[PDB]
């Protein structure tokens, strides 16, 4: 009567501490009822590893809480998938990236920030790259007991940016007598802590003029989710204190247009702040920095991501021998890196949205799937071909 | 008998401290002898400012040593040029960027470096962007009195990179008990100093596996001179400790080829080191980082620069009325952003290497110039048109 279809698939990412453990679930319909098999996304079947990974009932793959000593990479840093299968054929779920992280001490640092008097300053909370997936800045604190939270600007001067930095307008020599520490939160342990070091502004008096200079290391391409607020920085120091202008390149050209500042898109000193991000905010942005001595510019690439989904039209069709079978994968999300097709769990080497079988023979019956992928996400849709 | 030609032009950059002062020289031939006028490159004539800028004899523009209090931006941060002129017409020299910098205290910092045991580490000497044009790393020093200089690797482990960082192979927990300071040199004052802070490696024990992660901020496009050694870094941390591969994109494509390691081009852990750089080393490079968990990559753009020069063929020609006059600008150097032509000191709106005057009329006699420019350098060539 029916080939398998997924009712419930596990999400693309399962991140958890060794204390929390995890369970992921896969449910499929069909007639006869499909067997549910857990595999590594590569295709190997996976089994029971005592205390670490348990195929449970209800179709649940269970990662019990475990001691640091019992960490196993092949179990705990692994991409899994669910394979649903009956006599009519096989479907494979989206990828399931499992990352069990053993609770472990980390610290964030705040270093000295050297600035020319009169310029803006950006104080950064430095989170080691290998924990940064799990740690975010909550708030900023000074020795004089000022506390700054994400939201509005304080005293026309201090702003905690959406990207976590503390932005300070128009630094004066008095600003060198404060030190700054950030509070960070680890989303897998739920713990918060203050930074191990405190940072201060070191203010240089402007005695010589100088053209704006930007740092050697600049923001690599960004990927940020729709509906969130984005901030693009443009760090630069010079004397006279420079002014800042943002542009967005016209895609595929060397031509650019001035970013249009309004209710949604605002500029704070050299920082561009985009609220309620939409996919069309993606692109290459250029910040141009000027004073009466000279100018400089830096490019930043932004991709605003949206969740991947896929659906095949039609869900099932019956086609008489020798006639054509067409399946159309319809998808949403951003970016889409690839579209690719599978038949009963095996790649069939077609990478376009519409799959056409010219003349249906007997071994063309079975389950077909469309997968849409980018670097972080995957989504699948399935469909059945029956012979008439 | 002759229009002006330059014998000696000032260099593109004149950087000097207020204690040193400076003089720049312009010499041109011609008959009658041309008057030498100093202008701002924009075209305004410049005069004597008592104690700060003196048109001297010998055709020298002199910036005397001066007190910090007497700094003047319009004098001391300015692009000048030499205008040579007689009855036959005018030529203007290449741009002369003058930067008088008042001697002023700076400090470099070395911060904590967080690394996973078994990975490579890179210790950086942080030089404020607004003095970095003048300050370079000389050497690195530890508390245990180890001294490291540019050149060869020490003990198979420590290397001071051409770009100034201290590279450390395969960090072990014992490496956390040393602290590091850099010695820097200011090329305008000639002073050396040690860094204000010392940095240490903070070593994280690998308890969980993790895919390689690279920092948020990455090297922006580089410009480095021919014949020097270049190092391209690829900072990355993960567990297992990752391996590194470098590629160079085929220009104008998304295709890449593996960099070929030999006597000139070497790899030290994740660092690519190119000796005796040539202009053909320019391009977009990709570093790909892998371990058994995952991978990442980062792009770096390199331009290898070569000094600009220009020459017009022919230096002088006589052309009878109504006939065609052709001047051909021949140039060398890299990159070349623009080529543009002038006649007696005024832009004539032609931006190609060959200038063709279709039918020579009377007001076409005069001095012609070709300018070749990029963001950092300019070179000019001149030629005379005489009527027959
Ligand atoms: C604020 O600060 C920024 C600096 O970051 C300044 O913006 C720069 O302005 C300069 C000067 O106008 C720009 O340089 C100009 O670019 C033109 C475009 O080049 C294109 O075409 C060539 C081929 O001919 C390609 O090589 C190139 O990649 C581009 O595709 C050039 O045509 C200009 O050269 C001509 O004019 C100059 C005078 O300006 C002459 O000296 C030349 O001989 C030639 O005739 C010129 O090089 C630069 O590109 C801008 N950068 C950016 C990032 O925008 C702002 O000007 C500054 N604001 C103020 C008020 O000063
Ligand atoms: C070391 O680490 C690096 C990671 O940094 C790995 O290199 C990456 O490898 C992956 C996997 O092969 C690469 O992803 C693949 O890229 C292909 C090329 O995409 C082009 O064409 C599409 C349009 O179809 C464009 O969107 C895109 O911009 C490119 O122009 C894709 O075709 C691949 O998808 C197909 O195969 C995969 C299985 O690999 C299926 O899941 C898909 O459904 C589809 O059928 C795939 O996405 C990635 O690009 C590499 N990155 C870099 C920087 O090189 C190394 O693999 C790793 N080494 C080892 C040994 O693991
Ligand atoms: C997950 O992994 C970590 C192992 O790093 C486990 O947390 C660690 O648990 C030990 C023992 O429970 C903790 O040691 C204790 O510290 C307190 C002082 O704060 C002391 O009074 C106790 O006698 C004991 O020595 C250790 O601090 C803790 N480490 C961290 C970073 O939290 C955790 O138990 C594991 N989860 C399991 C096995 O379910
Ligand atoms: C160029 O500009 C700087 C101004 O910043 C001048 O250097 C400064 O000169 C003053 C006076 O010569 C120095 O002060 C002295 O310091 C010593 C102690 O080290 C003290 O014994 C003296 O009595 C005096 O107070 C100052 O240190 C120095 N600053 C720097 C950064 O070098 C310089 O003279 C100027 N050049 C000229 C005017 O030609
Ligand atoms: Cl979902
Ligand atoms: Cl297998
Ligand atoms: Cl396994
Ligand atoms: Cl938000
Ligand atoms: Cl020269
Ligand atoms: Cl004038
Ligand atoms: Cl002036
Ligand atoms: Cl060198
Ligand atoms: Na069926
Ligand atoms: Na704007
Ligand atoms: Na179908
Ligand atoms: Na999905
Ligand atoms: Na003449
Ligand atoms: Na290689
Ligand atoms: Na000529
Ligand atoms: Na030159």
- Strand ranges for A109-198 from DSSP E: 113-116, 121-123, 135-142, 147-148, 158-160, 166-168, 180-186, 192-194
Using alpha carbons, select from B203, B211, B113, B109 the residue that is nearest to residue B167.
Answer: B113
Give the C-alpha separation, B344 to B83, whole Å: 10
B258 by Cβ neighbours in 10 Å (0-12 / 13-18 / 19+) ranks as exposed
Is the peptide bond preceding residue B314 cis, with omega within 30 degrees of 0? yes
Using alpha carbons, select from A290, A199, A208 the residue that is nearest to residue A243.
Answer: A290
Give the C-alpha separation, A24 to B78, whole Å: 66
Residue B237 near residue B204, CB atoms below 8 Å: no
The DSSP line for B25-56 is E-EEEEES-PEEEEEETTS-B---BTTTBEE-
A147 by Cβ neighbours in 10 Å (0-12 / 13-18 / 19+) ranks as exposed
Minimal-distance CA residue of chain B relative to A197: B112
Residue B153 near residue B140, CB atoms below 8 Å: no
Asked if the Cβ–Cβ distance from A102 to B73 is below 8 Å, we say no
Which residue segments constitute the domains of chain A, with CATH numbers given? 1-102 (2.60.40.10), 103-206 (2.60.40.10), 207-307 (2.60.40.10), 308-388 (2.60.40.10)
Using alpha carbons, select from B156, B157, B139, B137 the residue that is nearest to residue B148.
Answer: B139
The DSSP output letter for A129 is T
Neighbours of ion ligand 10 (CB under 5 A): B 44
Determine the residue among B129, B241, B284, B294 to mutate to test chain A binding: the one whose Cβ has the most chain A Cβ atoms within 10 Å: B129
Give the C-alpha separation, A222 to A300, whole Å: 8
Q: For chain A, how long is the longest CA-to-CA vector? A: 87
Question: Resolution in A, one decimal?
Answer: 1.9
Give the C-alpha separation, A243 to A294, whole Å: 11
| Placement of tokens 């000796």 in the chain | B275
**From the list A71, A73, A298, which residue is nearest B293 (CB)?**
A73
Helices (H), chain A: 73-76
Using alpha carbons, select from B107, B50, B38 the residue that is nearest to residue B78.
Answer: B38
Q: In the numeric block, which tokens belong to residue A187?
A: 């989303």
Angle at B112 between CA B109 and CA B114, to 5 degrees: 145
Is the peptide bond preceding residue B111 cis, with omega within 30 degrees of 0? no
Residue B29 makes CB contacts below 8 A (sequence gap 6+) with B2, B4, B5, B7
Q: Is the CB of A297 under 6 A from ligand 1?
A: yes
Give the C-alpha separation, B36 to B41, whole Å: 14
The DSSP output letter for B177 is G
Residue B326 near residue B358, CB atoms below 8 Å: no
Is the peptide bond preceding residue B335 cis, with omega within 30 degrees of 0? yes
CA-to-CA separations, A296 to A243, A245, A371, B78, B172, in angstroms, rounded: 11, 11, 44, 16, 41
Give the C-alpha separation, A191 to A217, whole Å: 30
Give the C-alpha separation, A241 to A243, whole Å: 7
How far does the CA of residue B331 sit from the closest CA of chain A (Å)?
26
Q: In the numeric block, which tokens belong to residue A78?
A: 């692994």
How far does the CA of residue A58 sit from the closest CA of chain B (Å)?
29
Burial A199-220 (b: 16+ CB within 10 A, else e): bbbbbbebebbbbbbbebbbbb
The DSSP output letter for A76 is H
CA-to-CA separations, A257 to A17, A264, A286, in angstroms, rounded: 46, 17, 9
Using alpha carbons, select from A170, A85, A20, A26 the residue that is nearest to residue A366.
Answer: A85
Using alpha carbons, select from B309, B315, B314, B319 the residue that is nearest to residue B4.
Answer: B315
| Placement of tokens 């704070």 in the chain | A268
Residue A266 near residue A229, CB atoms below 8 Å: no
Q: In the numeric block, which tokens belong to residue B287?
A: 């570093």
Chain mean position to CA B172? 37
Give the C-alpha separation, B227 to A107, whole Å: 42
Asked if the Cβ–Cβ distance from A204 to B106 is below 8 Å, we say yes
Chain mean position to CA A331? 19
CB atoms within 10 A of CB B31: 11
Q: Is the CB of A338 under 6 A from ligand 2?
A: yes
Question: How do beta strands B243-249 and B13-17 pair?
Answer: unpaired
Using alpha carbons, select from B119, B95, B73 the residue that is nearest to residue B24.
Answer: B95
Instruction: Write out residues 295-314 of A within 8 Å (CB-CB) of B.
Output: 298
Contacts of B216 in chain A (CB under 8 A): 129, 132, 219-220
Residue A57 makes CB contacts below 8 A (sequence gap 6+) with none
Residue A115 makes CB contacts below 8 A (sequence gap 6+) with A121, A171, A201, A202, A203, A204, A237
Q: For chain B, how long is the longest CA-to-CA vector? A: 87
| Placement of tokens 């590893």 in the chain | A49
Instruction: Write out residues 206-225 of B within 8 Å (CB-CB) of A.
Output: 207-211, 213-220
Residue B134 makes CB contacts below 8 A (sequence gap 6+) with B15, B101, B186, B187, B188
Minimal-distance CA residue of chain A relative to B68: A207
The DSSP output letter for B77 is E
How far does the CA of residue A73 sit from the closest CA of chain B (Å)?
6
Asked if the Cβ–Cβ distance from A209 to B100 is below 8 Å, we say no
Residue A238 near residue A291, CB atoms below 8 Å: yes
B238 touches chain A (CB under 8 A): yes
């Amino acid at each position: 009567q029916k080939g398998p279809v997924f009712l419930k698939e596990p999400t693309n990412r399962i991140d958890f501490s060794n204390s929390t453990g995890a369970e992921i679930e896969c449910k499929a319909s069909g007639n006869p009822m499909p067997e549910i098999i857990w595999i590594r996304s590569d295709g190997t079947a996976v089994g029971d590893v005592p205390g670490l990974r348990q195929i449970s009932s209800d179709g649940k793959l269970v990662f019990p809480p475990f001691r640091a000593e019992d960490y196993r990479q092949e179990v705990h840093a692994q991409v899994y998938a669910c394979l649903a299968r009956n006599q009519f054929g096989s479907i494979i779920s989206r990828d399931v990236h499992v990352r069990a992280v053993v609770a472990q001490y980390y610290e964030a640092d705040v270093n000295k920030e050297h600035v020319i008097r009169g310029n803006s300053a950006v104080i950064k909370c430095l989170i080691p790259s290998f924990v940064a997936d799990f740690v975010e800045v909550v708030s900023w604190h000074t020795d004089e007991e000022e506390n700054y939270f994400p939201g509005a600007e304080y005293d026309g001067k201090y702003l905690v940016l959406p990207s976590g930095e503390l932005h300070i307008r128009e630094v004066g020599p008095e600003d060198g007598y404060k030190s700054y520490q950030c509070r960070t939160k680890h989303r897998l342990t739920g713990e918060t802590r203050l930074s191990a070091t405190k940072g201060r502004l070191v203010i240089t008096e402007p005695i010589s003029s100088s053209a704006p200079r930007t740092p050697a290391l600049v923001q690599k391409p960004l990927e940020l989710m729709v509906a969130h607020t984005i901030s693009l920085l443009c760090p630069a120091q010079g004397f006279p204190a420079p002014s800042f202008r943002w542009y967005k390149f016209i895609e595929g050209t060397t031509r650019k247009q001035a970013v249009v500042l309004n209710d949604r898109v605002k500029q704070v000193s050299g920082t561009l702040i985009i609220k309620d991000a939409v996919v069309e905010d993606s692109g290459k942005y250029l910040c141009v920095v000027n004073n009466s001595v000279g100018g400089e510019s830096v490019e930043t690439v932004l991709t605003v991501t949206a969740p991947l989904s896929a659906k095949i039209d039609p869900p099932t069709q019956t086609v008489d021998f020798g006639r054509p079978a067409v399946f159309t994968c319809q998808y949403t999300g951003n970016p889409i890196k690839t579209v690719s097709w599978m038949k009963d769990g095996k790649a069939i080497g077609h990478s376009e949205s519409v799959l056409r079988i010219e003349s249906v023979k007997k071994e063309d019956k079975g389950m077909y799937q469309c997968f849409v992928r980018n670097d972080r996400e995957s989504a699948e849709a399935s469909a059945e071909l029956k012979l008439g």
